[PDB]
């Protein structure tokens, strides 16, 4: 049921990947808003926040996952990236621990996702041509 004790920014950082996946909106909503010497630091901070948010959004967009919290893709998982079982990833791991594992393989996964999304777009265009 919906009985969270409390939801806050990064509150699920210590929870398992499965449990932390139910609080995605908690982090997603604090990513945009959580001359004098102090006047320039604030402007730089604002610009930097906008840039980081837009970088993440662009990465989502070119993968076909635009406007989605949990987006499923057509890229099969390579056992080389991580041989751990599904049960021991979503119930015995936190997203922080997982990130430290799939880090040497993140760029490969990103490239595969982009290529797969482009292929999907081309295939959809081809199919719509027949109709």
């Amino acid at each position: 049921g919906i009985g969270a004790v409390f939801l806050g920014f990064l509150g699920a950082a210590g929870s398992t990947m499965g449990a932390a996946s139910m609080t995605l909106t908690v982090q997603a909503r604090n990513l945009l808003s959580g001359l004098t010497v102090w006047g320039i630091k604030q402007l730089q901070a604002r610009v930097l926040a906008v840039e980081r948010y837009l970088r993440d959004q662009q990465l989502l967009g070119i993968w076909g996952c635009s406007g989605k919290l949990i987006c499923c893709t057509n890229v099969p998982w390579n056992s080389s990236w991580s041989n751990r079982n599904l049960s021991e990833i979503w119930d015995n791991m936190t997203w922080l621990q997982w990130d430290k594992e799939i880090s040497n393989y993140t760029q490969i996964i990103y490239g595969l996702l982009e290529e797969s999304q482009n292929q999907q777009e081309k295939n959809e265009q081809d199919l719509l041509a027949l109709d």
């Binding site: 990064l10 509150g11 932390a20 982090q27 604090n30 989605k68 949990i70 595969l112």
Partner: protein, 448 residues
């Protein structure tokens, strides 16, 4: 059934250590200030702090970038505040100084000089013969007798604007959106290593930019016990930071009833010179209760014996040597810059088994802040008597390299770097960078 697929999750609670441009936030309740506060974003009256259950984070009090950034910001604010103030270029002139001997105690004999000089008038073609009282620490004999200001062969001092207050005001260092500040809530944290109790905040607590050399004043106190923190306790070349669990009240005063003279050295420019002290002339000093100081020193020794044997003799000695800015407890008591001789505080030996301590202080008016050269500031005299009360929150000790089977350890005060003052406050904070995008394997597959 056994085939897994990449699933993209947005908003996963992940973060990475990062360095960013933290901005300041100040309380609304808190005319102008050196640490420009009207330019700081108002703080949230009800700060939000999220307890990160199960999270263990690695903090490094000594490689923390929030300290160097604070140092740079403090220096920049100092320079910005001093930019519009008067530049005392004409003050670099020959002075005919004579001793002040009108109702002086023996201790304050020769510490004050009565100097007369020719100074530029508002008109470029007229000069005025004025006089001012200068502390001996500010004048150098040129060789009754001819003197000159100490800075005249290094730079021209910039007078501090009288309407700009040096009083430290709490500054909350906030992080940009997409970044977070993790606070180590562990009460026995020693600055380094994992912190089992962590919470995330958007802004730090109010950190007062108090500037002092040997004693940490008006800082935050330890919750349980005196905490000794050092980058490497074994190394004797690394300073030891001591944080008291209970404050030691220190009363500092400048008894002289000073008089401020406004000498107009140019169009719209005024030089605020000391006039004549109304009454007897007596030394400036600071008082700390003997009993409270001894109790705190005993606690410090007890906590020090943990890292230096259970029976080693712990003795406190005064500063080795150097310039007045490192051998004395320097601070700023509401405009006046003190330099107190903390030789009575650190003088004792502790074996394995009412009154007050008066620290004779000296005042200076030409200040070289931040250990910089070629950039001095002239502190205008403060009219009337001066008296401030502060809390000795901690110490910055140094250890001597006693070899040859040394059963005794000698600790003496040491200041120098001003970062260690900020470090005593930004030791439980670290900036992290959020990574909301994550990829994990799942049985789910996209639909075509």
């Amino acid at each position: 059934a056994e085939n897994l697929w990449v699933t993209v999750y947005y908003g996963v609670p992940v973060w990475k250590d990062a360095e960013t441009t933290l901005f300041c936030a100040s309380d609304a309740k808190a005319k102008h200030n050196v640490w420009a506060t009207h330019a700081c974003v108002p703080t949230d009256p009800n700060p939000q702090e999220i307890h990160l259950e199960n999270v263990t984070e690695e903090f490094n009090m000594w490689k923390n970038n929030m300290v160097e950034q604070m140092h740079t910001d403090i220096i920049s604010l100092w320079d910005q505040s001093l930019k519009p103030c008067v530049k005392l270029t004409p003050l670099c002139v020959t002075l005919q100084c004579t001793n002040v001997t009108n109702n002086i105690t023996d201790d304050m004999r020769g510490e004050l000089k009565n100097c007369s000089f020719n100074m530029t008038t508002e008109l470029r073609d007229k000069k005025q013969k004025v006089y001012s009282l200068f502390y001996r620490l500010d004048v150098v004999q040129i060789n009754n007798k001819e003197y000159r200001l100490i800075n005249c062969n290094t730079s021209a001092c910039t007078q501090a604007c009288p309407k700009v207050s040096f009083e430290p005001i709490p500054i909350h260092y906030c992080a940009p959106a997409g970044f977070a500040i993790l606070k180590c809530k562990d009460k026995k944290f020693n600055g380094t290593g994992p912190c089992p109790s962590v919470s995330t905040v958007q802004c730090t607590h109010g950190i007062k930019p108090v500037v002092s050399t040997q004693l940490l004043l008006n800082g935050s106190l330890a919750e349980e016990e005196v905490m000794i923190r050092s980058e490497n306790i074994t190394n004797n070349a690394k300073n030891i930071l001591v944080q008291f669990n209970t404050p030691v009240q220190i009363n500092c005063t400048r008894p002289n009833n000073n008089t401020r003279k406004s000498i107009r050295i140019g169009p719209g420019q005024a030089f605020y010179a000391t006039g004549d002290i109304i009454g007897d002339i007596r030394q400036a000093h600071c008082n700390v209760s003997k009993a409270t100081w001894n109790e705190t020193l005993g606690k410090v020794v007890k906590q020090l014996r943990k890292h230096f044997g259970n029976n080693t003799i712990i003795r406190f000695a005064n500063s080795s040597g150097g310039d007045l800015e490192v051998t004395t407890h320097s601070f700023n008591c509401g405009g006046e810059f003190f330099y107190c001789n903390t030789s009575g505080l650190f003088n004792s030996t502790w074996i394995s088994n009412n009154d007050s301590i008066t620290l004779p202080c000296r005042i200076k008016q030409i200040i070289n802040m931040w250990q910089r050269i070629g950039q001095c500031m002239y502190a205008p005299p403060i009219q009337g008597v001066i008296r401030c009360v502060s809390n000795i929150t901690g110490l910055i000790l140094t250890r001597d390299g006693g070899s040859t089977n040394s059963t005794t350890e000698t600790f003496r005060p040491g200041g120098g770097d001003m970062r260690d003052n900020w470090r005593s406050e930004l030791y439980k904070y670290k900036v992290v960078k959020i990574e909301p995008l994550g990829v994990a394997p799942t049985r789910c597959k996209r639909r075509v």
